[PDB]
């Protein structure tokens, strides 16, 4: 089981809603990326929502900027049927399940 | 929400609206010509060629590239639903349907959608079904605008689909004869043209269409194209407004900001021109917009 | 091989060397992201980094936006020793191999 | 006609309009004239911006041309009050397509 | 903008013409009813009910 | 493998692309020819089509003005079925292949 936290300092969970990610560096070197996140915009979460909320930060917080986790899904993006970048993504979904 | 609780009740469950934010970048794209011409060329074409717009090469070439740039832009404006190919443009195509166009979907959003009359209509016999243009596709679409309350000024019409608007005339008129005594004898004329529909008047364009979804796949694969040609687009004029960005040293050719640019000599006796500019196009509201997608044509 | 165009419209490469991201709705429902990109500002991109640039816009546009990858990157972060979340993308990452 | 093939450019081969439709039954495919025929030709004659001034119509198309008046024609006599008499004409004579 | 500025103050007015537009919708599907005002409505009010 | 020039005194690759051909006598008696020959006008020649002008203005600067091309060309211009001047210009194609 998870047990993230928002890996900003100071301002996890804000008051209006609308947390400001961090600006992290993300090939390792050369490009910023600058998000924010905007909370509950269509209702409410539902209990499944606070643990895909969970791992929606964790992947791109900390994933992003590690340069092991962007050399593999580097290699997905060579595999020997990968175009038309919807197959990249459903590719990657049978190499995690 | 507001709903009814009783007299003696308690606090009926929280909500609030919701507003979303808009894209359309001007950032990435532009659209050029260039030229090549001589410095002989330009000389001894003033004694031997004929017509006095031949004689000067870079006035006329220079005023046939600024009007270049004017006619592959509007081709663009119901087409572009790509890249640095297309010019950067968006497009009516795109901006007028179903689609995305700004990051606001219309699966997850209902009400960012237009009014569609579209007339496939997939009961009939096969491979043609596309019926014409009768008279209750359009006084139809007119109620679709009041449920969602806009206002229209303006219809796009290739000159396909007005030709099929004239012969809605065709099989609703009937000459007549009166006032015959013993003057002048009857004098048939047979002709007419086009007021536009209560005082919102049809403009047609030549270069008029729309590139037919991925969703429409079996129409495109039993007509062969997918340019579609029969379009009407009820819009409004105030309501759907051109950019082009203002670069330092650019002059406003009809409008769009061009820029000149002379480029560097190599050698005696050779120019290398250039011309160009960079658009966008903006699509708010899509309340006062409606469509009549496949007419017979 | 992935072939790949930037997903926002008008935008695939800015003059300004901001990409900035359309807003793409992430838990398929409530929240929103609002990112933006920017491009070289720690030297220039060495022809390797133009793929896994290549593969990092291709998981931020395409894939939480879409709603099996992340319920298949909540499996994950469900397992039994995912936690404090360097051991949850190095669960990840092996599961991508 | 010139020097030109307009299968190199295509910007020649005037805008025509044919009335055989190939796959009516019979021998004789010929349609014999609409309406729609006068429309379909302004239609491709608009895509190209010229505007013609003439039709020189063999004097028996003209009979087809006047001939389509003949099908959609009536006389309505909406004066009542008397004082004279209605005053039968039953022919008239052609002006022209639009002007 | 000035008017998602004031954020109780705009929110005020998108309440109280929130239930104005349910107000006339409910003067057609009244039929008493409590959980839409308790009104009554064009439904049974110009037909043949009581 | 020639590496034909064209005939003109002065005036070998014109600027404004019009290349008037010099007035040539080509029955080596009688008639006057008075030739022009415009460069590029529907593109560029693509390093193909410069092999055939190569060859077009050799025929039409050094060849209907000789005396022994033009009694060649005259003794296929009586043969078995040579009539129709387009079987004329095919039968020649078989005689140079």
Same mark, same amino acid.
């Given at each position: 089981?998870?047990? $993230?936290?928002?890996?900003?300092? &100071?301002?996890?969970?804000?008051?209006?809603?609308?947390?400001?990610?961090?600006?992290?560096? #993300?090939?390792?070197?050369?490009?910023?990326?600058?998000?924010? $996140?905007? $909370?509950?915009?269509?209702?409410?979460?539902?209990?499944?929502? =606070? =643990?895909?909320?969970?791992?929606?930060?964790?992947?791109?917080?900390?994933?992003?900027?590690?340069?092991?986790?962007?050399?593999?899904?580097?290699?997905?993006?060579? &595999?020997? &049927? #990968?175009?038309?970048?919807?197959?990249?993504?459903?590719?990657?979904?049978?190499?995690?399940? | 929400?507001?709903?009814? /609780?009783?007299?003696?009740?308690?606090?009926?469950?929280?909500?609030?609206?919701?507003?979303?934010?808009?894209?359309?970048?001007?950032?990435?794209?532009?659209?050029?010509?260039?030229?090549?011409?001589?410095? !002989?060329?330009?000389?001894?074409?003033?004694?031997?060629?004929?017509?006095?717009?031949?004689?000067?090469?870079?006035? @006329?070439?220079?005023?046939?590239?600024?009007?270049?740039?004017?006619?592959?832009? *509007?081709?663009?404006?119901?087409?572009?639903?790509?890249?640095?190919?297309?010019?950067?443009?968006? +497009?009516?195509?795109?901006?007028?349907?179903?689609?995305?166009?700004?990051?606001?979907?219309?699966?997850?959003?209902?009400?960012?959608?237009?009014?569609?009359?579209?007339?496939? %209509?997939? *009961?009939?016999? +096969?491979?043609?079904?596309?019926?014409?243009?009768?008279?209750?596709?359009?006084?139809?679409? %007119?109620? !679709?605008?009041?449920?969602?309350?806009?206002?229209? %000024?303006?219809?796009?019409?290739?000159?396909?689909?007005?030709?099929?608007?004239?012969?809605?005339?065709? @099989?609703?008129?009937?000459?007549?004869?009166?006032?015959?005594?013993?003057?002048?004898?009857?004098?048939?004329?047979?002709?007419?043209?086009?007021?536009?529909?209560?005082?919102?008047?049809?403009? %047609?364009? /030549?270069?008029?269409?729309?590139?037919?979804?991925?969703?429409?796949?079996?129409?495109?694969?039993?007509?062969?194209?997918?340019?579609?040609?029969? /379009?009407?687009?009820?819009? !409004?004029?105030?309501?759907?407004?051109?950019?082009?960005?203002?670069?330092?040293?650019?002059?406003?050719?009809? +409008?769009?900001?061009?820029?000149?640019?002379?480029?560097?000599?190599?050698?005696?006796?050779?120019? *290398?021109?250039?011309?160009?500019?960079?658009?966008?196009?903006?699509?708010?509201?899509?309340?006062?917009?409606?469509?009549?997608?496949?007419? !017979?044509?």
């Amino acid at each position: 089981p998870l047990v $993230y936290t928002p890996a900003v300092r &100071g301002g996890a969970n804000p008051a209006s809603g609308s947390y400001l990610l961090d600006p992290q560096y #993300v090939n390792s070197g050369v490009d910023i990326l600058q998000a924010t $996140y905007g $909370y509950n915009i269509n209702g409410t979460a539902n209990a499944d929502q =606070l =643990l895909q909320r969970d791992a929606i930060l964790a992947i791109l917080e900390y994933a992003l900027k590690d340069t092991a986790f962007v050399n593999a899904i580097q290699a997905v993006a060579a &595999g020997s &049927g #990968v175009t038309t970048p919807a197959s990249f993504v459903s590719a990657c979904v049978t190499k995690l399940t | 929400t507001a709903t009814g /609780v009783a007299i003696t009740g308690s606090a009926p469950a929280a909500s609030m609206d919701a507003t979303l934010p808009a894209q359309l970048p001007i950032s990435a794209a532009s659209v050029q010509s260039t030229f090549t011409l001589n410095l !002989k060329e330009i000389e001894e074409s003033k004694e031997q060629v004929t017509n006095e717009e031949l004689r000067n090469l870079l006035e @006329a070439q220079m005023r046939n590239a600024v009007e270049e740039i004017a006619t592959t832009l *509007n081709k663009k404006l119901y087409d572009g639903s790509g890249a640095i190919a297309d010019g950067g443009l968006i +497009g009516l195509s795109i901006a007028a349907s179903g689609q995305d166009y700004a990051g606001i979907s219309s699966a997850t959003y209902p009400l960012w959608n237009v009014s569609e009359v579209d007339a496939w %209509d997939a *009961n009939a016999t +096969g491979t043609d079904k596309r019926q014409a243009l009768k008279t209750d596709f359009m006084l139809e679409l %007119d109620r !679709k605008i009041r449920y969602r309350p806009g206002a229209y %000024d303006l219809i796009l019409t290739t000159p396909k689909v007005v030709e099929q608007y004239k012969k809605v005339f065709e @099989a609703n008129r009937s000459y007549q004869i009166m006032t015959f005594d013993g003057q002048r004898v009857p004098l048939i004329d047979l002709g007419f043209n086009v007021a536009g529909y209560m005082g919102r008047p049809i403009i %047609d364009d /030549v270069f008029c269409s729309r590139t037919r979804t991925a969703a429409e796949s079996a129409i495109t694969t039993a007509l062969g194209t997918a340019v579609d040609e029969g /379009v009407m687009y009820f819009l !409004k004029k105030d309501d759907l407004r051109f950019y082009s960005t203002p670069v330092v040293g650019a002059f406003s050719a009809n +409008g769009v900001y061009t820029l000149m640019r002379q480029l560097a000599q190599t050698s005696l006796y050779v120019d *290398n021109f250039v011309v160009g500019c960079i658009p966008q196009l903006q699509l708010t509201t899509r309340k006062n917009v409606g469509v009549i997608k496949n007419i !017979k044509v």
